[PDB]
C-alpha cells in the first residue's frame, strides 16, 4: 500500500527527482510529533466497545424507523452485521490515522462500498448519522475533553491531529453517498 | 490469504496458491513461465482466485506431476489435497469422483472439485 513516507517518493518519482533537502522538511517535522501520533492512536482503541455502541444507542434514539419491521436495521441477522459494519469503518480509519495517508482507506475498504448500499438497499441518511457521531467523538477523545473517560496525558496542543482524522470522515463520507 | 487485490501484493497472492495447489512442490522458473497466459489472466481480473486455482490445476505441469505417474486412488487424493485442502470421507465419494474422469474426461474431473 502507501503511507505518508511512501507518498512523497511516488510524488517525486513522476519527476524522477531524488528526495533531498526540499521535501524532507515535511517529514523531519513528521517525527517531532511522531510520538504524539501514537499517543492519539491508542485513544481510539481504548473505548472502542463504547464507540460503536453509542452509534446505535443514539442513532436509533433519534431515528427509530430503522428498527421498524421491514426496516434496514430491523432483524438481528442484520444488527450483528451492522455492528460488524461499523467496527471495520473505525478500524480502517485508525489504520490511516496512524500511517498518515488515506490510501489504505480508499483502495482496500471504500472502492465498492458505494455499491454495498446500492445493491442491498442500505440507505445513505442512516449511515451519515452513524458516522457524524464518530467524527465528533474521535476528535473529542484526542483532546481528552470528554466527560467520562479521562486519559491523563502530557499537556499540549493536538489540533493538527484533529483535522488529520477529520479528513478521513469526508473521505469516507463522500465515497458512501 | 486475503481478498482485495492490489498490484503490488499479487506477488504474495499468486505463490501462496502455487504452493497450495502444487502441494509444496518445487516449481522452477522454466515451469513458472508455462503459466504466462493464465498467471497473466489472473492479474487482469479475468480470473478470480477461485478460478485461477482451476486454471493452475488445468496445466501441463499438474498433469505431469499428479496425473501421469499417479494411479486412481493417488489421483483423487492429490486433487482433494490441493483443491479442497482435505482428505476423502468414505468410499462413496471416491467412486463418484472416479466416474467423473472415465465417462466424461479429465478437464471435467478437475473442475468437478472447484
Amino acid at each position: 500500500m502507501l503511507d505518508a513516507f511512501s507518498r512523497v517518493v511516488v510524488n517525486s518519482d513522476a519527476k524522477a527527482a531524488y528526495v533531498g533537502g526540499s521535501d524532507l522538511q515535511a517529514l523531519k517535522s513528521f517525527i517531532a510529533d511522531g510520538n504524539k501520533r501514537l499517543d492519539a492512536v491508542n485513544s481510539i482503541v481504548s473505548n472502542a466497545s463504547c464507540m460503536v455502541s453509542d452509534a446505535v444507542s443514539g442513532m436509533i434514539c433519534e431515528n427509530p424507523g430503522l428498527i421498524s419491521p421491514g426496516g434496514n436495521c430491523y432483524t438481528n441477522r442484520r444488527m450483528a452485521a451492522c455492528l460488524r459494519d461499523g467496527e471495520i469503518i473505525l478500524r480502517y480509519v485508525s489504520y490511516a490515522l496512524l500511517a498518515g495517508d488515506a490510501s489504505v482507506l480508499e483502495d482496500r475498504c471504500l472502492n465498492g462500498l458505494k455499491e454495498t448500499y446500492i445493491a442491498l438497499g442500505v440507505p445513505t441518511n442512516s449511515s451519515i448519522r452513524a458516522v457524524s457521531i464518530m467524527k465528533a467523538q474521535a476528535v473529542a477523545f484526542i483532546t481528552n475533553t470528554a466527560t467520562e473517560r479521562k486519559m491523563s496525558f502530557a499537556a499540549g496542543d493536538c489540533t493538527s491531529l484533529a483535522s488529520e482524522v477529520a479528513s478521513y470522515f469526508d473521505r469516507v463520507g463522500a465515497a458512501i453517498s | 490469504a486475503p481478498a482485495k487485490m492490489s498490484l503490488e501484493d499479487r506477488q504474495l497472492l499468486v505463490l501462496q496458491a502455487i504452493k497450495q495447489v502444487f502441494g509444496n512442490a518445487y516449481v522452477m522458473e522454466e515451469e513458472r513461465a508455462s503459466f504466462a497466459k493464465q498467471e497473466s489472466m489472473f492479474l487482469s481480473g479475468e480470473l478470480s482466485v477461485r478460478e485461477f486455482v482451476r486454471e493452475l490445476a488445468l496445466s501441463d505441469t499438474y498433469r505431469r506431476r499428479f496425473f501421469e505417474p499417479c494411479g486412481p486412488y493417488r489421483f483423487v487424493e492429490l486433487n482433494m489435497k490441493h483443491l479442497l485442502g482435505r482428505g476423502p470421507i468414505s468410499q462413496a465419494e471416491v467412486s463418484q469422483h472416479v466416474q467423473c474422469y472415465v465417462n466424461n474426461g479429465y478437464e471435467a474431473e478437475i473442475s468437478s472439485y472447484v
Binding site: 465498492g112 455499491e115 454495498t116 446500492i118 445493491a119 | 487485490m5 499479487r10
Partner: protein
Amino acid sequence: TGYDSKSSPNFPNRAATRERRTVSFNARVARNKSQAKKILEKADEFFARSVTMQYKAFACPNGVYDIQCTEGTVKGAAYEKRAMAVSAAFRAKQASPAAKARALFENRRHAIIASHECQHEEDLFVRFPKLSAAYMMGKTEAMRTCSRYVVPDSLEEEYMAASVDRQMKERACPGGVYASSCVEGNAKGQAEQARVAALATAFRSAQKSASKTTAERYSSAAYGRDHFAHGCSYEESVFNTYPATAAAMRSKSYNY
C-alpha cells in the same frame, strides 16, 4: 448410470462482466458493482422517461389534443414516420468516441442552468448520462423553443431563421464527410419525406391560436438570454427584436 441432472454449477454464468480487464478490484466488489451496472443503467431509462411523459402532459394541459401532436397527417405515413424515429436512436448509438465523450458533458453545460434554483434538481442531473440528453429535448417540446411550432412573421426574421441553420449544417460535418445526425433517409423507403414532414407541420406553425404563438415569443426570448446571450448584449439585441434567432440555434452535444 442412473443418470440425473441437478441445477447448474455456474448459474450466474458471467452475465455481468465482459470487459475482461478490471482495475484489479476483487471478486465480491466485481460482482455487486456489476450488479449496480445493471441497476444504474436502468434508472437512466426511467428518469428521462418518467418526466418526459409528464412533459407530454403539457401537450394536453386540459387533456385533449391540439396540433402539437400532428403525428402523421396522411393515413399511411404514420408507420412511415416510425422508421427514422427508431433510426434517430440507432444513428445516435453509432456516434464516434470523440463525439460520445462530449455528448456527456455538453449536455451537462445547460443542465446546471436549468437546475440552479433547487439543489434537489442538480444532484440527479450530474449522476446520469442520458437524463439531460432527453431533458433538454423534453423541456423544449413542451413550451416550444424549437422551430417546430414557431412561424416567421417577418421576412426579416425569415432571413434570420435562415441565418444560423447553416451553422447547424456547419457542425454536422468535420470535413467533406457527412455525419449520422444530419441525414434524411436510410434505405430509400421515402421519396421526399423530410421536406413533406417539415411543411406539414410548418402549416401547424401558424394556426394553433394567436395566444399560443405570442407568449412563446416571450418564452423563447428570455430562454436564450438566460442560456446563450447572457455574456454578450449584442447577441440579445438580435434575440429580443427577433425571436426567430433564439428558438433556432441549439446546443452542441446532440448534433445539427
